[PDB]
Enzyme design. Sequence first.
Site, PDB file in Angstrom:
ATOM      1  N   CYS A 248       1.026  -1.209  -0.010  1.00 62.45           N
ATOM      2  CA  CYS A 248      -0.427  -0.064  -0.013  1.00 62.45           C
ATOM      3  C   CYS A 248       0.884   1.807   0.029  1.00 62.45           C
ATOM      4  O   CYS A 248       1.689   1.557  -0.297  1.00 62.45           O
ATOM      5  CB  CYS A 248      -0.819  -0.346   1.102  1.00 62.45           C
ATOM      6  SG  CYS A 248       0.091  -0.307   2.636  1.00 62.45           S
TER       7      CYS A 248
ATOM      8  N   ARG B 163      -3.016  -1.192   4.979  1.00 65.20           N
ATOM      9  CA  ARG B 163      -4.018  -2.376   4.658  1.00 65.20           C
ATOM     10  C   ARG B 163      -3.385  -2.930   4.324  1.00 65.20           C
ATOM     11  O   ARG B 163      -3.671  -4.575   4.010  1.00 65.20           O
ATOM     12  CB  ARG B 163      -3.975  -1.059   2.988  1.00 65.20           C
ATOM     13  CG  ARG B 163      -4.724   0.321   3.460  1.00 65.20           C
ATOM     14  CD  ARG B 163      -5.089   1.072   2.583  1.00 65.20           C
ATOM     15  NE  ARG B 163      -5.687   2.385   2.427  1.00 65.20           N
ATOM     16  CZ  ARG B 163      -6.095   3.478   1.499  1.00 65.20           C
ATOM     17  NH1 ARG B 163      -5.740   3.488   0.617  1.00 65.20           N
ATOM     18  NH2 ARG B 163      -6.475   4.804   1.883  1.00 65.20           N
TER      19      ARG B 163
END
Length: 501
Positions: free
Chosen positions: A435, A441
């Site tokens: 990410c 994430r």
Amino acid sequence: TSRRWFHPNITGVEAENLLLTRGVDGSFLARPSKSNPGDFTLSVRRNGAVTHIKIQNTGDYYDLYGGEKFATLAELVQYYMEHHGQLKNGDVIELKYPLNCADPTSERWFHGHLSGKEAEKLLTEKGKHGSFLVRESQSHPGDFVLSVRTGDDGKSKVTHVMIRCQELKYDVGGGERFDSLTDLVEHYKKNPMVETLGTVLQLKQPLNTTRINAAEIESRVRELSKLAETTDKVKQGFWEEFETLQQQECKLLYSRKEGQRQENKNKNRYKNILPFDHTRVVLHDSDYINANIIMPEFPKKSYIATQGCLQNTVNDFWRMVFQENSRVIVMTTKEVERGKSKCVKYWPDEYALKEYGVMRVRNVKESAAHDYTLRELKLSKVGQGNTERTVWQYHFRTWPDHGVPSDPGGVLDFLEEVHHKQESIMDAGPVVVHCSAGIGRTGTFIVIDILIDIIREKGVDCDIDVPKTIQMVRSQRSGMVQTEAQYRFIYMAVQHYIETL
Ligand SMILES: C[C@H](O)c1nc2c(N3CCCc4ncccc43)n[nH]c2nc1N1CCC2(CC1)Cc1ccccc1[C@H]2N
């Protein structure tokens, strides 16, 4: 290792009074923000006054106002206690003395208002030799009960020890008196109580109450979602699980020396978010990239967690992909979010051919979908025609700027296609996932994939343990899974997956 400077249940005012009355200049603590839930506050005493410094985390990293960005609060505290990282209208802020918290709420062995009966059932069903837990006493308010299982049909037994609270100190009826439950448990971990006839009351490991049967994820989520109306009902929920997990991060302060070396500083997107030395990807044939190997049994079943490319790390990125034989890339960020660059374009335009150092990449074909775009790439080494291999880049584009998606269905559909592609490729290397900083994430996606793959292999009647899996992934890259929102989203995503089976 210690994380007792984190106070999970104090207000700003209580934090001020604690520092002014029990601390000295240089004393400090951290706590969750009650004004802006999801944020944290670092409170520091200096020159007889208390300064408050805001920490923000929307899912990517811990952003210290006036300071730097960090992978975990423990890495943030260590950095400024060791390094100065000069935290600082000009003046300098010193983290000298942690002001320790006595609250046991986030200890792995503490279960609050659990009843002595609920406790007996858990110990018999999921317990083994040395499993122990501590709970508040019903019959003697203010006191606690320590229950231990010992054994190998009557070959095992449970033993209950009463912990008295007398004028703010704790004891088990004799010997030393301690200032907190944690101090008492640690003492009798090193110095086990011994029964009259020889039995050692070994406190070997906290009773596991997080492992569940995947088939029952729906009722478990319902349980973990409950909101206690009073503190009588405060029991194990999402927040209790998560903050107990966060407390264990001080065990993961592994060395990151390579990423701090002079020649590697400008290869890191965030100056203090660095790969562990013992799992970093070493580039052979400069050897450094901000990436770690993630194994679900810590190549085809493994991952590489990495940061979003910088303009001066694109060539190293493709050296890594080629060297590790990776055939799938998962990117879970836009190039730019909130006006700031998160990842440089490291792939050619559709139909175009580009050279990245000694590596050559052709963007054969792009396919746009609702939540993501698929790019078919052909990677080769210049001067070696026989090295060409297809690399499939799955670029998820709709992850919200802050927090997590409101529904896991799009991520799960995306994840399913990623998994199918990887499995169809014989001898494929680890899946690359990135990410911005490559921990939030990125950590959320990898953990979900790991958990779902257990269900894939063992069926829905298998055991999964979300915090256990996260801690194992966090031992290979700092701060994998950043926020409570992501922790919850992982549960929600495993639930959604099972319901669509
Ligand atoms: C030991 C237990 O199963 C557990 N474990 C982890 C856990 N880890 C991280 C480290 C490695 C690791 N390995 C394997 C598995 C889990 C874990 N993270 N969060 C965890 N939470 C857990 N329970 C919920 C929270 C309370 C302890 C029990 C229980 C409770 C009741 C009321 C109020 C407050 C609390 C929490 N005090």
